[PDB]
Amino acid sequence: SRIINHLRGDPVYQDNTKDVSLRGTFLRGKYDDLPTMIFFTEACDLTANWIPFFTNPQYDILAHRNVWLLNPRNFGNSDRHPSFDLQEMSDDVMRFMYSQKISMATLGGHGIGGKIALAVGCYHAERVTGVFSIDSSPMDQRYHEAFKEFKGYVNALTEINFKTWSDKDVKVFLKENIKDPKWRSIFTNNISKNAKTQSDSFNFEINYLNHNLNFNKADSLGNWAVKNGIYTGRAHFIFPEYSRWVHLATNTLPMHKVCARVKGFGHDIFYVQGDENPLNHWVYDFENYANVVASKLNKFLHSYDGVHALLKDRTEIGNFMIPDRIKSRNDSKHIYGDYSPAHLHHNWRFNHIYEKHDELDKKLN
Amino acid sequence: LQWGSLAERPMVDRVMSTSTWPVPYYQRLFKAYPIREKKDKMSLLLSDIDIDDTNWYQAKDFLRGSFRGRQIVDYVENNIASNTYILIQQDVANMAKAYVHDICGYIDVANKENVRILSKGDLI
Amino acid sequence: TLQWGSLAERPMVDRVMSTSTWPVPYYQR
Amino acid sequence: MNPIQKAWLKILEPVSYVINEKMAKRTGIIGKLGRFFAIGPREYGVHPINRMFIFMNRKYMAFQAVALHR
Amino acid sequence: SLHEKMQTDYLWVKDHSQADSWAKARTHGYNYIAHTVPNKKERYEMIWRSMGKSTDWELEKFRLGKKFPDRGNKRRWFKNLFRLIKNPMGYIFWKTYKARLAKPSLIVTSMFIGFTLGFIKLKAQSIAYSKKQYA
Amino acid sequence: GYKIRNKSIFWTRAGWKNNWHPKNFNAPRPSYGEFTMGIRCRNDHHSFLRYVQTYRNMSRHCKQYFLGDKQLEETFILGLRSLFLVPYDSQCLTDQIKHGGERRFVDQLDRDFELISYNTHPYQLFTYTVRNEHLAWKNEQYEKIQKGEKTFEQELLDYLDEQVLAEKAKLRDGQNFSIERMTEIALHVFRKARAGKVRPAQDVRGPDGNVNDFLEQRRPFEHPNPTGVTH
Numbered sequence A: 001s002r003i004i005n006h007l008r009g010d011p012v013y014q015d016n017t018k019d020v021s022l023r024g025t026f027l028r029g030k031y032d033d034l035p036t037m038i039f040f041t042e043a044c045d046l047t048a049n050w051i052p053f054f055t056n057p058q059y060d061i062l063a064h065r066n067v068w069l070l071n072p073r074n075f076g077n078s079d080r081h082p083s084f085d086l087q088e089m090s091d092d093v094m095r096f097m098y099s100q101k102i103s104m105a106t107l108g109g110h111g112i113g114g115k116i117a118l119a120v121g122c123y124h125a126e127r128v129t130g131v132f133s134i135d136s137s138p139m140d141q142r143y144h145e146a147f148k149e150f151k152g153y154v155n156a157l158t159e160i161n162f163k164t165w166s167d168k169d170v171k172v173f174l175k176e177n178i179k180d181p182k183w184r185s186i187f188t189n190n191i192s193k194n195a196k197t198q199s200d201s202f203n204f205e206i207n208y209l210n211h212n213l214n215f216n217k218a219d220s221l222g223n224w225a226v227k228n229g230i231y232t233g234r235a236h237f238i239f240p241e242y243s244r245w246v247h248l249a250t251n252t253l254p255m256h257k258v259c260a261r262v263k264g265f266g267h268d269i270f271y272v273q274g275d276e277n278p279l280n281h282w283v284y285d286f287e288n289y290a291n292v293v294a295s296k297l298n299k300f301l302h303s304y305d306g307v308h309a310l311l312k313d314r315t316e317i318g319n320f321m322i323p324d325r326i327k328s329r330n331d332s333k334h335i336y337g338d339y340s341p342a343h344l345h346h347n348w349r350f351n352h353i354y355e356k357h358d359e360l361d362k363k364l365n
Numbered sequence B: 001l002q003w004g005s006l007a008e009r010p011m012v013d014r015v016m017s018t019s020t021w022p023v024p025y026y027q028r029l030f031k032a033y034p035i036r037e038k039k040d041k042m043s044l045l046l047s048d049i050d051i052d053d054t055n056w057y058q059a060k061d062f063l064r065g066s067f068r069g070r071q072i073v074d075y076v077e078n079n080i081a082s083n084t085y086i087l088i089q090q091d092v093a094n095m096a097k098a099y100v101h102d103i104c105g106y107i108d109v110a111n112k113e114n115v116r117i118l119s120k121g122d123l124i
Numbered sequence C: 001t002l003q004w005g006s007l008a009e010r011p012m013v014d015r016v017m018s019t020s021t022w023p024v025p026y027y028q029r
Numbered sequence D: 001m002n003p004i005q006k007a008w009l010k011i012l013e014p015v016s017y018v019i020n021e022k023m024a025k026r027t028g029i030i031g032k033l034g035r036f037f038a039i040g041p042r043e044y045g046v047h048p049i050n051r052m053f054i055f056m057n058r059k060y061m062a063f064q065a066v067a068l069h070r
Numbered sequence E: 001s002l003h004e005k006m007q008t009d010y011l012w013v014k015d016h017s018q019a020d021s022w023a024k025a026r027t028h029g030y031n032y033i034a035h036t037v038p039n040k041k042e043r044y045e046m047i048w049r050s051m052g053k054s055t056d057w058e059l060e061k062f063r064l065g066k067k068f069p070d071r072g073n074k075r076r077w078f079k080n081l082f083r084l085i086k087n088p089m090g091y092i093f094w095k096t097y098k099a100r101l102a103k104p105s106l107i108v109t110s111m112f113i114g115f116t117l118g119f120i121k122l123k124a125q126s127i128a129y130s131k132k133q134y135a
Numbered sequence F: 001g002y003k004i005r006n007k008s009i010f011w012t013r014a015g016w017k018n019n020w021h022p023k024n025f026n027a028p029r030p031s032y033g034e035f036t037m038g039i040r041c042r043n044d045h046h047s048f049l050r051y052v053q054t055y056r057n058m059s060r061h062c063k064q065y066f067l068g069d070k071q072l073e074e075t076f077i078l079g080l081r082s083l084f085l086v087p088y089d090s091q092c093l094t095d096q097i098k099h100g101g102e103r104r105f106v107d108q109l110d111r112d113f114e115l116i117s118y119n120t121h122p123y124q125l126f127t128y129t130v131r132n133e134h135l136a137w138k139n140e141q142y143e144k145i146q147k148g149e150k151t152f153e154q155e156l157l158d159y160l161d162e163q164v165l166a167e168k169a170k171l172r173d174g175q176n177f178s179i180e181r182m183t184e185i186a187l188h189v190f191r192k193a194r195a196g197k198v199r200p201a202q203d204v205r206g207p208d209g210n211v212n213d214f215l216e217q218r219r220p221f222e223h224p225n226p227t228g229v230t231h
């Protein structure tokens, strides 16, 4: 009703990668003015599944930020385009932020969603306050067993023909071809019947997706290319102890390799204590995994997200002075010294809060 | 005095910053603590301590700051047969007794009224 | 980061394994 | 800050006036010279030697209490 | 359309009022480069991307424009030298903190000290033997 | 995938994508008869006929080593034309080249014929090697057909014709057997067939991220000393 507001639209196939519009759910915050959070769900996975996590009073995440549960191109309700270039998919978000009048946002993702979130910070860092990645890493996952199954399932889904196949023929096809319970449930709920019951189809573009995965090259979603670059801002990574996607042994190095400000394990990288279970990827289902992610998430948003690099925490804003490089300012009669860096309002561009407060300041004097 | 908007949070939570390239390489090791002052903040040791004597002793201290609280303290420490001020309710025995002894006392009120109304005159 | 460790352990930070096997051979092909 | 620094300021009161009021705010090399030799409180004026004694004094004194308290 | 709409929008591309007074990095990162880090190639991409935004991805303007050094690194050797003189123990302590996190055994630490002090002891004897040769 | 982002990639001081008349200080200037005493120039109008005679020599001198292979003469002719049609179809404005593209290409082709006259041109040696590898495989088929045996190529054609009948015998709802379906049927047979062969590892990485080379033998150590020859 009010707290839950998801704009409604129809996917449009686009020949130009720039004329792509993103659609998703918006969760309003408790308080009037709060920075915004953009969260990307797992590929081919529903945004609704993350609603109970962000709308739980015990966690109380909305008390911190407004949440945009957004679908990438070719997923959910967003527009469709065969290219999956993270640079193109990142510009899509920047246009969404512009159309919605968002100056800068907090980015999050689950699995492959984490990659999409980090790409935006890599291509648009001046407008991203922080990144919170869940069970993902900026890494090539083409040869990870977890990815192969997803890559394998998507290929099996191309065999079904909704026109000829009956509803029962589908259910039998999924159970036999899809062994994973969660993936199976995700795909079933992704099936939708268009108006006038003309026929049933998947909400996500099965053709464009399979080509990206089946080709299994740099543009594949499992792959993380050197072209994506480096993320300059705040980044926190949280993944299960026993995770098929991110192995603690070596899959943590890409974080240091791709994120410049990542301090290391115990500060920006954590593992959730858990058992070996292929379903641990879906932390929102298990309370134990979710409770830790939420606490760590609330801590990142409250103290670490949107904080200058050389400052430890948000507590140091206004009391820690950063050294200045000589000959860095245009003014020639400037005595170089330490300064506290400027932290701006989350939507200072599309509002006039600075113009308003300037007037109030004059009234004092 | 000024309180602002209840809905709005402190400007610190709203004010944000973003990164860019180039980036400083230095990774902060510790938080700066040039001046040793941590006033007005309570100790974090008071985290998971179970109920003890400090709870009823501090309760009286705060209750004695009010007029109604002073009556509770004086009555509890004088007119309650308990071997400890750490009151723990695990049964509603003492609560039901006080209710049946009160709600029952107000019985016969209607029958009493009937006596007056009916003793007024004889129908016949 | 630019502070990866000592020179002797530099060839350690290169390997990225696709499986959960321990210990992991360090050499990156 | 310490008493010895305060004594310098009283002695350098007229010098502080010339460099800060007149020179420091002038343009050109005269300004660069005044802003460079500006007089005031010391940037990075701490004395590590004095701080070193304080540390070693406190560390060695705690050792005295253990060795002497037998 | 939405792409060009936001590019032209002044609000979307507008420096904050205090932006002029802020310290500005006047280099793209091509003056001092990290050559042996595993993200070497990723660093170059951010330099290439920064150079393109300055010229609207028309790098002919960069070829024609003036190239400048990193004037922020000026006099950096002198400055570190004065900090070492001001407080050598603090300069040495913090510059070696991350290295000292991995402490070797008592045996190794003793070998370092023993061989170092023994080398200094022989150096002193050779200085003394030179005074014997001068006499 | 990846596109060049620099918009000025094809810019030169002479214009966009100009590889015919690069800009240089000593530019061509006209000459006037009434004022010109003498001149030393090597340009002439003999390039057209040299272009013709050069084609006839390169063709006739390479056919000396084809041994009457008519199919090779015709294939070589198509390749020889592709080498002479470069200036006629190139983006480069070969008519606007600095000092005459006609003379330039002719002199360049003459250097090729010099090697052809000695039978040392890489295209010649490449042709002999490519042809011998082809005839050896065609003779292997001929020897198998004369013996009544079936070739590996016919076993697939026959195995594919039946697989199509099985697919169209069940495709009754629709009746458009596209070329796409016909294609993915053959590829499924080629991958299965190619995998059956004992071929050297071509892809760097197999199903796992590990490389498929003989050097990708890591711990644990479980191989003993190597054994000697058996008598």
Ligand SMILES: CCCCCCCCCCCCCCCCCC(=O)OC[C@H](COP(=O)([O-])OCC(O)COP(=O)([O-])OC[C@@H](COC(=O)CCCCCCCCCCCCCCCCC)OC(=O)CCCCCCCCCCCCCCCCC)OC(=O)CCCCCCCCCCCCCCCCC
Residues within 6 Å of the ligand: E073, E074, E075, E076, E077, E078, E079
């Ligand atoms: C008619 C008769 C005429 C008579 C007079 C004739 C005289 C002719 C004068 C004309 C010549 C000057 C021309 C003007 C130059 C203008 C150029 C310019 O714009 O500035 C560039 C230059 C650029 O510096 P920058 O951009 O600010 O930053 C530097 C970088 O960051 C780098 O800094 P960094 O932190 O990164 O560290 C690196 C640095 C420092 O690196 C080092 O480690 C070197 C340290 C050298 C000093 C220490 C030596 C060691 C021994 C002493 C130990 C001291 C430390 C001990 C510590 C305590 C120990 C317990 O490297 C340098 O060497 C920097 C030098 C500046 C660059 C110039 C090119 C140098 C290449 C050659 C190097 C070898 C020469 C070294 C000369 C010394 C330079 C300081 O600035 C200048 O230095 C200008 C100097 C001009 C001063 C002129 C003053 C007036 C001269 C006349 C006075 C009267 C003289 C009378 C003489 C009588 C006869 C003997």
Ligand SMILES: CCCCCCCCCCCCCCCCCC(=O)OC[C@H](COP(=O)([O-])OCC(O)COP(=O)([O-])OC[C@@H](COC(=O)CCCCCCCCCCCCCCCCC)OC(=O)CCCCCCCCCCCCCCCCC)OC(=O)CCCCCCCCCCCCCCCCC
Residues within 6 Å of the ligand: D044, D045, D046, D047, D048, D049, D050, D052, E082, E084, E085, E086, E087, E088, E089, E092
């Ligand atoms: C490379 C390998 C081979 C190395 C060989 C050895 C190298 C030389 C060794 C020298 C060691 C002597 C130590 C002296 C006592 C230091 C005690 C102390 O607590 O330190 C803090 C102490 C500061 O404590 P403070 O007195 O309270 O001053 C703070 C005030 O706020 C200061 O107020 P401010 O902030 O306004 O001042 C600005 C500041 C920054 O400005 C500068 O310092 C830069 C320019 C300074 C001029 C260049 C210095 C040239 C040498 C000085 C003159 C010759 C020697 C004088 C005698 C020094 C020995 C006491 O000035 C200072 O930092 C302090 C003043 C510097 C001294 C200048 C006056 C020198 C004349 C002394 C007169 C009084 C003594 C009577 C005469 C004694 C002779 C009989 O530092 C010093 O005073 C100077 C230390 C110099 C050390 C340099 C080299 C250290 C690192 C060597 C590494 C060895 C390799 C092994 C490393 C292994 C790593 C893995």
Ligand SMILES: CCCCCCCCCCCCCCCCCC(=O)OC[C@H](COP(=O)([O-])OCC(O)COP(=O)([O-])OC[C@@H](COC(=O)CCCCCCCCCCCCCCCCC)OC(=O)CCCCCCCCCCCCCCCCC)OC(=O)CCCCCCCCCCCCCCCCC
Residues within 6 Å of the ligand: C006, C007, C008, E099, E102, E103, E104, E105, E108, E111, E112, E115, E116, E119
């Ligand atoms: C003004 C005077 C000028 C002249 C004198 C100039 C003197 C300059 C010396 C300056 C310092 C040297 C550079 C040090 C860089 C900073 C420290 C460092 O290396 O970062 C830590 C880093 C690793 O240490 P870490 O991160 O703490 O990990 C260790 C674990 O935490 C825990 O340990 P772990 O379980 O992993 O392994 C056990 C332990 C193994 O136990 C050890 O640490 C072995 C050391 C035992 C004591 C050796 C005797 C002490 C040497 C100094 C006294 C010299 C005696 C007099 C010499 C007379 C002839 C000149 O490993 C270590 O802890 C570190 C060993 C790695 C080698 C350390 C660097 C070489 C030794 C120092 C060179 C000294 C040169 C002085 C003279 C040079 C003249 C040209 O070391 C490296 O940089 C890796 C480099 C690869 C080293 C292996 C291959 C080296 C092959 C060349 C050997 C050269 C021998 C030279 C002999 C000298 C003549 C006899």
Ligand SMILES: CCCCCCCCCCCCCCCCCC(=O)OC[C@H](COP(=O)([O-])OCC(O)COP(=O)([O-])OC[C@@H](COC(=O)CCCCCCCCCCCCCCCCC)OC(=O)CCCCCCCCCCCCCCCCC)OC(=O)CCCCCCCCCCCCCCCCC
Residues within 6 Å of the ligand: E103, E104, E105, E106, E107, E109, E110
């Ligand atoms: C009731 C039962 C007994 C209770 C006894 C009470 C014990 C109280 C403990 C009190 C602890 C004190 C804490 C404060 C000190 C901590 C700071 C420290 O330096 O500790 C090392 C500390 C820890 O090192 P670590 O890497 O963790 O290794 C720990 C252990 O070494 C372990 O390393 P590991 O795991 O690799 O084990 C291998 C081990 C393997 O060792 C073995 O397997 C057998 C050892 C056989 C030794 C044979 C000796 C043969 C002698 C032949 C010599 C003949 C010449 C005689 C000349 C006669 C002339 C006629 O080899 C070593 O570890 C060598 C360690 C050197 C030990 C030297 C002392 C040996 C005898 C001590 C006897 C004490 C009574 C114990 C009775 C127990 C009997 C069951 O090192 C540091 O990192 C701190 C900085 C050290 C900088 C170096 C300079 C330090 C020197 C100043 C220290 C302060 C003042 C002096 C203190 C005493 C130092 C010896």
